[PDB]
Amino acid sequence: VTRIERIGAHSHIRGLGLDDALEPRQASQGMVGQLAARRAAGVVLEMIREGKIAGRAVLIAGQPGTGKTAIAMGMAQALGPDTPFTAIAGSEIFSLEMSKTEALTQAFRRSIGVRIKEETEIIEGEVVEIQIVGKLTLKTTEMETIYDLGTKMIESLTKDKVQAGDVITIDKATGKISKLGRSFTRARDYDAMGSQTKFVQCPDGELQKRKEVVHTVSLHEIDVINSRTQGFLALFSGDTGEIKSEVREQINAKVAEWREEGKAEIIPGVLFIDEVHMLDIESFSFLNRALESDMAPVLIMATNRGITRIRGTSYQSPHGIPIDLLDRLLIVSTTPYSEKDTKQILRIRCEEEDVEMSEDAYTVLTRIGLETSLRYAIQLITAASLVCRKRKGTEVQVDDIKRVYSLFLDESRSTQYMKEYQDAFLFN
């Protein structure tokens, strides 16, 4: 069945393909070539796992199509889902709801997980009888007990309309009641059931259990929850506005106290900002200070620009980043692919897309990709597969590649054809 997630541009990548010594293996876990860059990404991944040093910034820089985002996806896959990995595009911070600095702060705080443990003492059981002073009788498969009821407790039992046969949980620390459902029985079967009705088995073991529960949240979620009375709604709608510095400072201090008490754990993650050259000078200046915080995640960036104009200024800088921020980060450089690496990337893409191709087809597709671009060849893989299926074939041949090459143009051929008829296109 077609699940929500389908074959995308990075579906074949399932990690960095490194060994225990971080030596890059050729054609491992979907990664081909980029040996030096993959080794550097492994070193950065070890830094992220260690977590000791906050605010380390890494810029993955290279030519278009050299696997920068592929390396980022490999890092995200190799890193466990427990550790946060916030992947955004540079253009996601330009919002009408909040300033750019607020958006970068929220991206920073979303990339730091905090794991909070909590112990509670609850009484869970099936209600046998309730008498309106008051008395309540509960039972499990192993025990039966009767309690005396206070004024607030009898009020809570009445308001929730707890009836005999229900399964309820009452927290001794707070005295609140929650109805988990009603136990099914010979007499409680009905022709229609209410929306809230849930059938549940009688609880096992002892009534008064001691719980240990661990909640995994992030600093941004804590900020939003503490932003206003119904702040957790903004965890859905995103209408968080600009969270005040008071709330953030009080949360940083409370989390520090929690970690000192052993209640919470901090899991520093990664903030990947692809296409980082969309950030403006204000964003870069904010990042220069934001990375100096001890609650800063490890920052990874990707760009393909050369000596280009910094957005928001008239200055030109390498990678479109001012040298203040470039001095604060390490640069990993990608390398253009060889013929062998191109062919192996095409083979892995065919294996993911479930396409069978003849060897001559592999040679011609590799030549096309070397001459035009790797992405164009990847697209022509599925194009030729479709054209072959329309032909009632079972293996993609060179003729199908020539067919799709004639049907779908690349940038160069399309540009040449546009220039040939430039009198018809607008605003040349």
Binding site: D20, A21, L22, R39, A40, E46, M47, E50, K52, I53, A54, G55, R56, S99, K100, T101, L136, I146, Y147, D148, L149, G150, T151, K152, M153, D171, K172, T174, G175, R228, D239, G241, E242, K244, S245, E246, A256, R259, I266, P268, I281, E282, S283, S285, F286, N288, R289, D294, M295, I307, S314, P318, H319, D327, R328, L329, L330, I331, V332, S333
Partner: protein, 429 residues
């Protein structure tokens, strides 16, 4: 705290008693003239005499401007409010830039409130009224309070009978009574009467410890901005306000003047003590002309904190102007209101000292030859780059089963990762 940041090794200005900077102390190396001037600035902050005095840290990148500001903050302690800001933060979407600046100004003025409360708390043991003939008439209400220390009888004013029945205080209930108002507050049944069979949570409380009558001192630290925010929007109008997004508001000068008056009244009454602090504005060159102009008036206020600016832009066009260049991206008018402290480039020896201190703070064992190689790399490239190589080289060494960084690990890490200049060279080609 536990995680290691770029400034986690800065523990203060390494100054002696005579105000001179040691060559290397408290995590800082060199910057003797700049540390001495920062020392005079720290004395200025601690003197509390002056308001609105501005100092500009100016110098090349990686010359310790932010390290010196955080060293000043460490010298001042945690009592003095030190508010870090970056110039990019003024461009808010909820309020005007001048409001962001004024809010950060008021965040750096601290106020310490001292409250002394007298309370009579304990488990109630009797509530007998004292009948009398009027010159049934009661002239006193005797309440007996029990604590783990002992028992006390209080000859309370008869009017407290209304509050006792309002609070439904009964024998065996833990209460506390404040000396001033004389109103009783009930806090639950004493836990000595709680059984394991009855279910209630809030209605039980342990017997108070200590003497029945207590004198409590509560000290709270606030900023003038905290009071501003509290009085600007007090917490069905509350329902609508909490449903809708509580945006920042452009707090009027009227409210700030009223709050200044209230704080002066508290300081006269002795309830409160002012702790004026420091606003640090890094990357101040991100401010626009309107912000710098506002800062002209703000620094002339008798209420303003001491502000520390930092810039490295050199002769650059002022943001929000066209072709108006200024020595630091700051208009010359503001520069006349600030003292400038220059920061200077480090020698290779100072770079080696900083690298060693960073390795110590990160917990990294570095060999002498490895330290020399990384220093020589840092004399090329940048200091920041050489520092950043420390932990990846330590990890590379740990992979190879070495407890200390060897030179080969530094060489390999340098071969893996490149600096801004090497990348510029690759881009040019």
């Amino acid at each position: 705290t536990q995680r290691i940041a770029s400034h986690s090794h800065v523990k203060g200005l390494g100054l002696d008693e005579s105000g001179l900077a040691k060559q290397a102390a408290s995590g800082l190396v060199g910057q003797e003239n700049a540390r001495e001037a920062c020392g005079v600035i720290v004395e200025l902050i601690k003197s509390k005499k002056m308001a609105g005095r501005a100092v500009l840290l100016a110098g090349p990148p990686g010359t310790g401007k932010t390290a010196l500001a955080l060293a000043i903050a460490q010298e001042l302690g945690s009592k003095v409010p030190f508010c870090p800001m970056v110039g990019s933060e003024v461009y808010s979407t909820e309020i005007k830039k001048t409001e962001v600046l004024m809010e950060n100004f008021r965040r750096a003025i601290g106020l310490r409130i001292k409250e002394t409360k007298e309370v009579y708390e304990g488990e109630v043991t009797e509530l007998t009224p004292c009948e009398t003939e009027n010159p049934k008439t009661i002239s006193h209400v005797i309440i007996g309070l029990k604590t783990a220390k002992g028992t006390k009888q209080l000859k309370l004013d008869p009017s407290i009978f209304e509050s006792l029945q309002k609070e439904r205080v009964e024998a065996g209930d833990v209460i506390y009574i404040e000396a001033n108002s004389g109103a009783v507050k009930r806090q639950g049944r004493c836990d000595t009467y709680a059984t394991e069979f009855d279910l209630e949570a809030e209605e039980y409380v342990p017997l108070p410890k200590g003497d029945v009558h207590k004198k409590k001192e509560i000290i709270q630290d606030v900023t003038l901005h905290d009071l501003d925010v509290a009085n600007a929007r007090p917490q069905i109008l509350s329902m609508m306000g909490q449903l809708m997004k509580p945006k920042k508001t452009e707090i009027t000068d009227k409210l700030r003047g009223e709050i200044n008056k209230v704080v002066n009244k508290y300081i006269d009454q002795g309830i409160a003590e002012l702790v004026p602090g420091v606003l640090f504005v890094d990357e101040v060159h991100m401010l626009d002309i309107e912000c710098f102009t506002y800062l002209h008036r703000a620094l002339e206020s008798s209420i303003a904190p001491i502000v520390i600016f930092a810039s490295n832009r050199g002769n650059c066009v002022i943001r929000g102007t066209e072709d108006i260049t200024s020595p630091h991206g700051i208009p010359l008018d503001l520069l006349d209101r600030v003292m400038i402290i220059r920061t200077m480039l480090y020698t290779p020896q100072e770079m080696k000292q900083i690298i060693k201190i960073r390795a110590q703070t990160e917990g990294i064992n570095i060999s002498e030859e490895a330290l020399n190689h990384l220093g020589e790399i840092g004399t090329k490239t940048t200091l920041r780059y050489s520092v950043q190589l420390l932990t990846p080289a330590n990890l590379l060494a740990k992979i190879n089963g070495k407890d200390s960084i060897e030179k080969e690990h530094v060489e390999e890490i340098s071969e893996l990762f490149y600096d801004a200049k090497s990348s510029a060279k690759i881009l040019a080609d």
